[PDB]
Amino acid sequence: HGSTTFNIQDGPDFQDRVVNSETPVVVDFHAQWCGPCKILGPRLEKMVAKQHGKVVMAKVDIDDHTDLAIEYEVSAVPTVLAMKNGDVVDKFVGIKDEDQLEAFLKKLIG
Amino acid sequence: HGSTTFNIQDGPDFQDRVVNSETPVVVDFHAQWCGPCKILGPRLEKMVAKQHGKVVMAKVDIDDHTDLAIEYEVSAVPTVLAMKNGDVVDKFVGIKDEDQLEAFLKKLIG
């Protein structure tokens, strides 16, 4: 559990690493068929990594974990949710650039 | 099978019932998390049924067919591809009303 960026493995994993997270979390719902996801994912991953634990990034492949997509009412990908204390606190859909992501993260982190 | 409307189960089933179809095929990419698909899928499936074999409908659960969404560059649902002798000949994304679907089918069937 050393990495601030990680693939969600299953329901349990989500509940532990995300719902029960002591730090703010960005949840990236993505799939291999989603082109914009292929740019956004790594861009967000890099920016989260640089925060060294002030925020974590939980990646959820909606093919592998379609239940989590249903639960969180995903309607397209990429969808990124900001979560804190188990609640959804912010959300965007689609690609964002580095400036936009940086703003998103600072708002979440404080 | 006897039905003009069906679920694609796997890769071979797509080769047999779509790529090797002797009739024109409408291929409906949907997902369990997609609200609009709940409207479109049934609407289209009924209209297809009514043609009693002049066209067939291959339903593709995107999340069970990453491969096919990759191949046909499906990045959202619903997406519907019209296909004939192995190739894409028309496409739409999102819901369509009955008039629209009629036109789409007439254009494909002739």
Side-chain angles (χ1 to χ4, degrees), chain A residues 32-33 62-63 66 70 74-75, chain B residues 32-33 62-63 66 69 74-75:
Chain A
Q32 313 147 221
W33 45 260
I62 62 161
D63 295 338
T66 309
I70 292 173
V74 171
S75 44
Chain B
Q32 297 303 310
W33 43 260
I62 200 162
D63 289 314
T66 308
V74 179
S75 57

Side-chain angles (χ1 to χ4, degrees), chain A residues 85-103:
Chain A
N85 302 150
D87 296 341
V88 180
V89 300
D90 212 343
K91 166 175 199 234
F92 70 81
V93 176
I95 307 176
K96 312 267 158 173
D97 68 28
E98 303 162 32
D99 285 335
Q100 290 178 305
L101 289 174
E102 176 193 356

Side-chain angles (χ1 to χ4, degrees), chain A residues 5-9 14 26-42 44-45 57-69 72 74-81 92-94, chain B residues 33 62-63 66 70 74-75:
Chain A
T5 69
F6 50 87
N7 294 314
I8 292 295
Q9 246 107 73
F14 190 86
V26 158
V27 184
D28 172 17
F29 294 95
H30 74 288
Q32 313 147 221
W33 45 260
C34 161
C37 299
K38 302 188 185 198
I39 301 263
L40 178 70
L44 219 192
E45 239 176 322
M57 180 177 181
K59 298 178 293 161
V60 176
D61 182 293
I62 62 161
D63 295 338
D64 299 333
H65 309 270
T66 309
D67 44 356
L68 258 351
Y72 278 88
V74 171
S75 44
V77 287
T79 288
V80 177
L81 308 192
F92 70 81
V93 176
Chain B
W33 43 260
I62 200 162
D63 289 314
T66 308
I70 290 181
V74 179
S75 57

Side-chain angles (χ1 to χ4, degrees), chain B residues 11-98:
Chain B
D13 195 29
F14 189 86
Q15 183 79 1
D16 171 46
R17 306 187 89 161
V18 182
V19 172
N20 296 337
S21 180
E22 287 217 29
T23 71
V25 179
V26 175
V27 184
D28 172 27
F29 288 83
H30 72 282
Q32 297 303 310
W33 43 260
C34 165
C37 302
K38 304 180 173 176
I39 297 143
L40 181 69
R43 175 172 305 145
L44 181 48
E45 187 164 22
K46 187 167 205 176
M47 294 178 59
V48 169
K50 291 167 140 157
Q51 299 285 312
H52 290 158
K54 293 172 192 222
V55 63
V56 290
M57 179 181 184
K59 297 170 275 180
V60 187
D61 186 317
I62 200 162
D63 289 314
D64 300 313
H65 296 283
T66 308
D67 62 333
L68 274 345
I70 290 181
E71 179 178 9
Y72 293 98
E73 299 193 284
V74 179
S75 57
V77 289
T79 285
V80 171
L81 307 175
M83 296 185 53
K84 237 271 203 88
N85 318 303
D87 289 325
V88 175
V89 300
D90 204 358
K91 163 160 182 202
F92 71 82
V93 179
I95 307 155
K96 301 281 168 158
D97 70 27
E98 291 173 21

